[PDB]
Amino acid sequence: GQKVHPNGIRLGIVKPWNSTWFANTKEFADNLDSDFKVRQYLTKELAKASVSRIVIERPAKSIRVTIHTARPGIVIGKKGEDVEKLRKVVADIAGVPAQINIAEVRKPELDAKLVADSITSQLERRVMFRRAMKRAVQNAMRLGAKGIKVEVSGRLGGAEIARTEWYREGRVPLHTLRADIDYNTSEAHTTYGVIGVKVWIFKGEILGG
Amino acid sequence: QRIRIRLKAFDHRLIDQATAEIVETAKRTGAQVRGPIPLPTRKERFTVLISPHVNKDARDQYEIRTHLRLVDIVEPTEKTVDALMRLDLAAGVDVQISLG
Amino acid sequence: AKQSMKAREVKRVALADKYFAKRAELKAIISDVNASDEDRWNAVLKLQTLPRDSSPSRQRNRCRQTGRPHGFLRKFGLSRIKVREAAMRGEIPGLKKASW
Amino acid sequence: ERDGLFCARIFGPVKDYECLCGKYKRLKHRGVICEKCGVEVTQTKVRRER
Amino acid sequence: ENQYYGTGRRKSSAARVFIKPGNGKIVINQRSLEQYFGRETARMVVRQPLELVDMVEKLDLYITVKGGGISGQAGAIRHGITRALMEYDESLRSELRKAGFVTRDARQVERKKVGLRKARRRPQFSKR
RNA sequence: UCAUGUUCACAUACCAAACGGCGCGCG
RNA sequence: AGAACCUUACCUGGUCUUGACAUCCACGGAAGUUUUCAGAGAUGAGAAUGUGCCUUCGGGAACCGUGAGACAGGUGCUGCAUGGCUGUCGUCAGCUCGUGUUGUGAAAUGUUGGGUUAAGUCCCGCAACGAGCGCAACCCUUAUCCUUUGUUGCCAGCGGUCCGGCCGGGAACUCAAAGGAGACUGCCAGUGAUAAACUGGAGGAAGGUGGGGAUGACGUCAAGUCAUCAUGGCCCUUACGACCAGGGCUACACACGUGCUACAAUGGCGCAUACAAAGAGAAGCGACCUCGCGAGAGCAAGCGGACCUCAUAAAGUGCGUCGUAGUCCGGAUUGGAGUCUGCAACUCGACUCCAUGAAGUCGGAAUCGCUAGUAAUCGUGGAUCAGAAUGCCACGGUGAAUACGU
Numbered sequence A: 001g002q003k004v005h006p007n008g009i010r011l012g013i014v015k016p017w018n019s020t021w022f023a024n025t026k027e028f029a030d031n032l033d034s035d036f037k038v039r040q041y042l043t044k045e046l047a048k049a050s051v052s053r054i055v056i057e058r059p060a061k062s063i064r065v066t067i068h069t070a071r072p073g074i075v076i077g078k079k080g081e082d083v084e085k086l087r088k089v090v091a092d093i094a095g096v097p098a099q100i101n102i103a104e105v106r107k108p109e110l111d112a113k114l115v116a117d118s119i120t121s122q123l124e125r126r127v128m129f130r131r132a133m134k135r136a137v138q139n140a141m142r143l144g145a146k147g148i149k150v151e152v153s154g155r156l157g158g159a160e161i162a163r164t165e166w167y168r169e170g171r172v173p174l175h176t177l178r179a180d181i182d183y184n185t186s187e188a189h190t191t192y193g194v195i196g197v198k199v200w201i202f203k204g205e206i207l208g209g
Numbered sequence B: 001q002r003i004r005i006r007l008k009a010f011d012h013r014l015i016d017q018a019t020a021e022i023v024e025t026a027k028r029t030g031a032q033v034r035g036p037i038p039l040p041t042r043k044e045r046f047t048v049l050i051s052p053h054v055n056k057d058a059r060d061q062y063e064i065r066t067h068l069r070l071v072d073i074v075e076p077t078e079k080t081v082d083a084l085m086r087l088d089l090a091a092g093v094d095v096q097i098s099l100g
Numbered sequence C: 001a002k003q004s005m006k007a008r009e010v011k012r013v014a015l016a017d018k019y020f021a022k023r024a025e026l027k028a029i030i031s032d033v034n035a036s037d038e039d040r041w042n043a044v045l046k047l048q049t050l051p052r053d054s055s056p057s058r059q060r061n062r063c064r065q066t067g068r069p070h071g072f073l074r075k076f077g078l079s080r081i082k083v084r085e086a087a088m089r090g091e092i093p094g095l096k097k098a099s100w
Numbered sequence D: 001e002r003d004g005l006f007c008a009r010i011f012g013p014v015k016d017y018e019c020l021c022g023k024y025k026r027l028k029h030r031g032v033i034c035e036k037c038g039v040e041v042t043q044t045k046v047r048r049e050r
Numbered sequence E: 001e002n003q004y005y006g007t008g009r010r011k012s013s014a015a016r017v018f019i020k021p022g023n024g025k026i027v028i029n030q031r032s033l034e035q036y037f038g039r040e041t042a043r044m045v046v047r048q049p050l051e052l053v054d055m056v057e058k059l060d061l062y063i064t065v066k067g068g069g070i071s072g073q074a075g076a077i078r079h080g081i082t083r084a085l086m087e088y089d090e091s092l093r094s095e096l097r098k099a100g101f102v103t104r105d106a107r108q109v110e111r112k113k114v115g116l117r118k119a120r121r122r123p124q125f126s127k128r
Numbered sequence F: 001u002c003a004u005g006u007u008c009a010c011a012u013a014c015c016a017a018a019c020g021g022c023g024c025g026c027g
Numbered sequence G: 001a002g003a004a005c006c007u008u009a010c011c012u013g014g015u016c017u018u019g020a021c022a023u024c025c026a027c028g029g030a031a032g033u034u035u036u037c038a039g040a041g042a043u044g045a046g047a048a049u050g051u052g053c054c055u056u057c058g059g060g061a062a063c064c065g066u067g068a069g070a071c072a073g074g075u076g077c078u079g080c081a082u083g084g085c086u087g088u089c090g091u092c093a094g095c096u097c098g099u100g101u102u103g104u105g106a107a108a109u110g111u112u113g114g115g116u117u118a119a120g121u122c123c124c125g126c127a128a129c130g131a132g133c134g135c136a137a138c139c140c141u142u143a144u145c146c147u148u149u150g151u152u153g154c155c156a157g158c159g160g161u162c163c164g165g166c167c168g169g170g171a172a173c174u175c176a177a178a179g180g181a182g183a184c185u186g187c188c189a190g191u192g193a194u195a196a197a198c199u200g201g202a203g204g205a206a207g208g209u210g211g212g213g214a215u216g217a218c219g220u221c222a223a224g225u226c227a228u229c230a231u232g233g234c235c236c237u238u239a240c241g242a243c244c245a246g247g248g249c250u251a252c253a254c255a256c257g258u259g260c261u262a263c264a265a266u267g268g269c270g271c272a273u274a275c276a277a278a279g280a281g282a283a284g285c286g287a288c289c290u291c292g293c294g295a296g297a298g299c300a301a302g303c304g305g306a307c308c309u310c311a312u313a314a315a316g317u318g319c320g321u322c323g324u325a326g327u328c329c330g331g332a333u334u335g336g337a338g339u340c341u342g343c344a345a346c347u348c349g350a351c352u353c354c355a356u357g358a359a360g361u362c363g364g365a366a367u368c369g370c371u372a373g374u375a376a377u378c379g380u381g382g383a384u385c386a387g388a389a390u391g392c393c394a395c396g397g398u399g400a401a402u403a404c405g406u
């Protein structure tokens, strides 16, 4: 019953775009490729620093990255040694002057991407999938999500038959376009294969737009 | 010798914000900007197959909408031209200042 | 796509970039109605001599991520599946689902 | 005003450890020279030295 | 004189009707009614409102119409004329509405749908 | 009036004010 | 969403083996350049030009070459090990939970009953009371109006005119977007359990979800995809990896699916002539003029575009002809001549011209779509793309028949 992607169905309405720049068709593909590169590099580097959302925004032949992250202190390092290194590598990849900004995620128990990452990490290091998932749901509800759903899928506990299990708490109105549903995915590369994690977090119902 | 400014953006709210800002700059700096005229939006539609392999009728139709705004300023003064040059706009809105 | 396939594509692109001026010159000579028959013949033979992968019509557009040689879209430089993934995540600015 | 008696690319940047054209604002870029205006990103302390 | 205006619209047509007292003249894009619409149905439809509200030998009409084709354009003109008449008199709303001319006919064209050969025709089906 | 359907196989389970005159005054 | 080469994964032959693609060292060399012979090419041998950016200068980094291995590589197998993505029942109205109660228990009840609704929609009842995912709404588009603004768009009223909105101008109108208003069974009468609703009518551009889209519950089919990608296991590693030229994927006794074009006069042909919408464009769209029967060629404005180009809508309308013929229907097929793209159109492109002029006279059993701007019919555009659509995705023109009923 394949469901529409909640972010993509909500862009414009309640949700913003991650990349926010204009380009004509001459420069569009190149810009997209560069963004892909920068995002890939940044994720590879800052896998341990908990990174929720890279937001690329290029004006005037210059790139401005904005890393939404749970631990700024770890992204910045002391005196900004690592941010500076990152900035320069991003600049080389793009081919323009770079500028990195860092947005601090205060509640990473409500940030879907972060939650998914945590669950996947636990799965990889062989925690009980069910336990990890339950903990994730409880924590989000405790922090004050209006609702949360978590789904894990495939070869759970190294079982020969794959199956998907999911827990829901509160309300998660997926068909409501004005519903602020944060959503993301991750993949646990276990010894028996890939295990997919999806996480929906209903923050509330935005009425402004 | 009027300065023409073409604003192009994917978001319409942003284009409105930019154009209003430009208008404010002109009207403050003493100039006769004609008006923020909305040119037509380009709805560039794309249609892709959603399945990784067969099933042809399963498809998604996306579209990018480019919004246009023509703002002309009549009589370029010193203050006006220099102000225009100084003022940098929002990143997500491509501006094109054609003098003539 | 295979690594080899991707490499082949890059090689073709590089060759095309290299030999563009020369090939254009030869073609112009061959086309030119106001030109000698012997010269034209020589030009045709020279063009044959040049490497085949210098010809732009040799290089296939492939997804810039996966290398997929079908379902390509020039504006994005990506095959349909990757375009969809990016669009849903919000990676392609301005793009969203279209209805009318 | 650039190439005047204060031009940040002649003498050095005004902001503490960050550049004038705005392109770079972190110690990682320390010692790069931009190509928007041409300033060197470095210690603003050296603006009194050069 | 007074010049009473009305915008007509139908399928993709858009008429500009300028009513003016006088003889029963119709000018559609600097052409006679018969010249422009060399069609009986079209002519009938553009006349129709005037015949209903006895002003056929009473009014000039300067028209300009853009878009659509013959039938749509005629419909648009009819709508415009009725609107203009209402502007001019405003007592005629009842007769005109009863006739059914005040209603803007909102039928346009159903878009073509992925999967479908047309708006609704699906391609021919088989079991085997 | 409507017969039939081969075998075996079902997963999950506790970043803090700056520099010069002119003065008056204190010492 | 496009196989001549490429693509390409297949075959044949020719070749390579730390490798086409990475990191790592070692040490010899700036990169790059320019040509030559042999070769189908992959390459293998040569001959020339440069031999440079930055060093605290014991050299580095950009970039080749050679040697060692660790490794690379695999469009190899398993979709019945998987993620992700998708079809499907089905845009069907359903699927559950907490607590309570009932039952030894699987379970039940809620979630049935009376009505009503497109709807588990709503009201009423009721050992249930609540909640969730679905319905609905929120989103896009279309139909009416209003405010704002007016070029590249508009021309109502003014003067001018080369009678062209073309130029002074105007901001009215169309239109262009942005923001508002509007439709809610809101008002009226009746029916109805003092109901939810239903039947009509009033106004209104729109009336009962206004039209159309997006939106696809829990799940089903060990459904589809290991060849987009990723990925567990397995397998190959002087070869199931890599490079090349040529061929194949376009074969043809035959069988089926989906289409196009027809069998004609509601038509073919000729001449004149009207009315669209939506798109695309810089290694691009290409005007004008000249040449060519034509496809096209030469020159060459413009224009990242409400400006310029693609770009002449066609069906229609008028006049003529044909007069029911295998025809002035039909265009397959083949011969000759060409054009363009392209290193290259033999296999195997598209198109043009001249010739040719098959079958086919409305299609057996059977079977499909469609309820309204729909079907039918007519053209137009786009993606992919050097070239290569009758397919796909969009756009407008004309515009029906019928629905008694289950």
Ligand SMILES: [Mg+2]
Binding pocket: A001, A002
């Ligand atoms: Mg699924």
Ligand SMILES: [Mg+2]
Binding pocket: A002, A003, A004
């Ligand atoms: Mg879907």
Ligand SMILES: [Mg+2]
Binding pocket: C001, C002, C003
């Ligand atoms: Mg690969």
Ligand SMILES: [Mg+2]
Binding pocket: C057, C059, C060
């Ligand atoms: Mg090609």
Ligand SMILES: [Mg+2]
Binding pocket: E029, E030
């Ligand atoms: Mg006139």
Ligand SMILES: [Mg+2]
Binding pocket: none
């Ligand atoms: Mg089928």
Ligand SMILES: [Mg+2]
Binding pocket: none
């Ligand atoms: Mg038997």
Ligand SMILES: [Mg+2]
Binding pocket: F005
């Ligand atoms: Mg049986």
Ligand SMILES: [Mg+2]
Binding pocket: F008
């Ligand atoms: Mg057995």
Ligand SMILES: [Mg+2]
Binding pocket: G008
């Ligand atoms: Mg081939």
Ligand SMILES: [Mg+2]
Binding pocket: G073
């Ligand atoms: Mg390997």
Ligand SMILES: [Mg+2]
Binding pocket: G074
């Ligand atoms: Mg492999």
Ligand SMILES: [Mg+2]
Binding pocket: none
């Ligand atoms: Mg493998």
Ligand SMILES: [Mg+2]
Binding pocket: G079
């Ligand atoms: Mg399966």
Ligand SMILES: [Mg+2]
Binding pocket: none
């Ligand atoms: Mg699967």
Ligand SMILES: [Mg+2]
Binding pocket: none
């Ligand atoms: Mg299979």
